[PDB]
């Protein structure tokens, strides 16, 4: 462990030599001949033959955190599975749904740099003891599914993965699984139960995926982004990846900014960047200027909202954002200006959580539909002000009382909307009361 401290005051733009996804935009070849020229699949045999403990210690020195929204460090997850297992095979499982709205980054990673994903699968399988890599994909994701299947087949004909992985005598067969369109299948235990052929239906946490996972075997579910930045960590050292961002927030993150933006786009940036500099440098600024900005959602629908006064002096890492009461999560920025009514957007997001709730456990089965009814009344104006704090308690009866964090990820934006825009809801219901009173 023990990642190095940063000791840097201001975090500027990421240099192009520091950008990992060099073919993110798609100006070079996605195939293996372009990827070998771009720096992928280089000295993989040495890193694989150097041992699992060296790769786990390099990840722990690098300070890599989870990119899927949990925020749990990947070094601890990869060191949970270094314990010996008797009679049971070991599995690495890659999550690639991202049904959180605002998120498009790892779709571009799979469609444009798939050999980074395959090399990271081999590196994590060597570091973890896994003998097979399972990659889940959306049913809506088909063109990049065929792209990743063709890249996996090209890696099989190259001999980089397979029975003999780069001449190291390691058996690692990489399979890719096509899953139907479901946001709940992005949860790790639900993706296990989808890989086992059942419904979504997420498992309880008192069994852990390192203990009981896919096919009853020890497994570990990791994101596309963590796996894709793993071989760049292994090749360029953990101190280089720890030289970006603050302590306990180290690394580079692939931010995508959409919404009321002149140029909605995805860029790879150093962590603890200012949000205003992030929009104004890469994305061309908020439409109507910075004074026209109403709110930003920093990480998609799992995270609450940020108003303008908090937005003017906020940083993009985990720790400063959770000091500002909102998780970073998936790091997908949605920008809404002053011409956008916010209640329709939050009602749409609560309806999205109602549609993508699996329906197993009670509070997310029922209270999310309750919140969809209450925000439908809030959009229309039929409610009273005394509903509002009651709606807060509905969130307080869901957050922490569910199997997933989908209940937490639905209780959070209602809490953020109430805490930042309660007088706007009061003005909306006063306008509706004055409308119906005549």
């Amino acid at each position: 462990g023990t990642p190095p401290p940063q000791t840097k005051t201001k975090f500027g733009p990421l240099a192009d030599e520091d950008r990992i996804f060099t073919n993110l935009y798609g100006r070079h070849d996605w195939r293996l001949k372009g990827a070998l020229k771009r720096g992928d699949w280089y000295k993989t045999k040495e890193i694989v033959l150097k041992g699992a403990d060296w790769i786990v210690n390099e990840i722990k020195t690098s300070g890599l955190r989870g990119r899927g929204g949990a925020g749990f460090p990947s070094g601890m997850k990869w060191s949970f599975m270094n314990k010996p297992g008797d009679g049971r095979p070991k599995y690495l499982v890659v999550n690639a749904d991202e049904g959180e709205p605002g998120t498009c980054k790892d779709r571009e990673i799979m469609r444009h740099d798939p050999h980074k994903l395959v090399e990271g699968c081999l590196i994590a399988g060597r570091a973890m003891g896994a003998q097979a890599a399972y990659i889940y994909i959306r049913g809506e994701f088909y063109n990049e599914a065929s792209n990743m299947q063709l890249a996996i087949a090209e890696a099989y004909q190259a001999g980089l993965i397979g029975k003999n992985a780069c001449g190291t005598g390691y058996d690692f067969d990489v399979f890719m699984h096509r899953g139907a369109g479901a946001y709940i299948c992005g949860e790790e235990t639900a993706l296990i139960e989808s890989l086992e052929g059942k419904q979504g239906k997420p498992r309880l946490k008192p069994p852990f995926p390192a203990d009981v996972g896919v096919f009853g075997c020890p497994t570990t579910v990791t994101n596309v982004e963590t796996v894709a930045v793993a071989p760049t960590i292994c090749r360029r050292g953990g101190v280089w990846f720890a030289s970006f961002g603050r302590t306990r927030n180290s690394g580079t993150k692939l931010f995508n900014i959409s919404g009321h933006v002149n140029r909605p786009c995805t860029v790879e940036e150093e962590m603890s960047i200012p949000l205003k500099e992030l929009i104004e440098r890469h994305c061309g600024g908020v439409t109507g200027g910075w004074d026209n900005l109403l709110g930003v959602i920093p990480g998609g629908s799992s995270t609450p909202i940020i108003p303008k006064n908090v937005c003017d002096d906020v940083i993009m890492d985990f720790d400063g954002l959770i000091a500002a009461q909102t998780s970073l999560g998936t790091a997908a920025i949605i920008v809404m200006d002053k011409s956008t009514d916010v209640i329709k957007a939050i009602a749409r997001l609560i309806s999205f959580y109602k549609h993508e709730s699996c329906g197993q456990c009670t509070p997310c089965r029922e209270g999310i539909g309750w919140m969809n009814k209450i925000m439908t009344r809030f959009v229309k104006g039929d409610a009273q002000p005394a509903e509002i704090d009651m709606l807060w308690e509905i969130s307080k009866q869901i957050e922490g009382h569910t199997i997933c964090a989908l209940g937490d990820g639905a209780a959070w934006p209602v809490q953020g909307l109430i805490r930042h825009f309660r007088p706007e809801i009061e003005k909306r219901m006063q306008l509706h009361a004055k409308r119906v009173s005549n």
Partner: protein, 214 residues
């Protein structure tokens, strides 16, 4: 409109058969070789999709054939195919236009796109056009949001939709002509427009910044 309880219909019933193609049977035995023996139930997630790649939609004979192949009861395949919304248990058109409605696409005017679709094709969401050519059924998030508004017609992501662009899309599709997918503003997918602010120069390549002792 969507029902989770099946009733007997002339459109879908166990009396109508559904047999796999020999090439599709080779695909069946190639799919079943991935999963370990004794845990082949995990094969039913692509296999039903394979039925959706053969019939165009999912009847109950496909469910019975999957349960016969995997040696499972029919009700497990029923609850798996009922849980997922990608499997259409109702008959659908040839070109399945699925639009987006969730607010990272609604800030860019996806309601205008849905209004244009309902105006031209004459039916609401979840309905089928009478010649079985088009079907509007809104799905919730397409997994890519910076190119909003975004629809999918038969698994191709049509991005950056001005209403005139979707007018051109329907005018091309009604004459059974292929249309170029992706964004329609001349923008290659997921990049800033005009001047590239990132990834402008060439990459360094292998051997750049190698770790010592490797």
């Amino acid at each position: 409109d969507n029902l989770f309880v099946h009733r007997d219909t002339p459109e879908d019933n166990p009396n109508i058969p559904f047999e796999f193609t020999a090439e599709n049977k080779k695909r069946v035995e190639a799919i079943l070789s991935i999963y370990p023996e004794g845990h082949k139930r995990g094969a039913m997630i692509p296999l039903l999709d394979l039925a959706q790649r053969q019939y165009g939609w999912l009847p109950i004979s496909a469910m019975h054939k999957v349960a016969e192949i995997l040696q499972l009861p029919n009700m497990r395949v029923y609850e798996v195919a009922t849980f997922y919304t990608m499997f259409m248990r109702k008959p659908t058109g040839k070109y399945h236009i699925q639009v987006c409605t969730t607010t990272p696409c609604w800030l860019r005017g996806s309601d205008d796109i849905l209004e244009t679709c309902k105006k031209q094709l004459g039916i609401g969401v979840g309905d089928t056009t009478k010649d079985r050519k088009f079907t509007i059924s809104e799905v919730e998030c397409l997994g890519a949001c910076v190119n909003a508004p975004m629809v999918a017609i038969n698994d191709d992501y049509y991005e950056d939709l001005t209403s005139k662009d979707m007018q051109d899309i329907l005018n091309d599709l009604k004459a059974d002509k292929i249309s170029p997918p992706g964004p329609r503003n001349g923008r290659f997918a997921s990049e800033p427009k005009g001047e590239p602010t990132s990834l402008s120069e060439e990459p360094k390549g292998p051997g750049f910044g190698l770790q010592a002792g490797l």
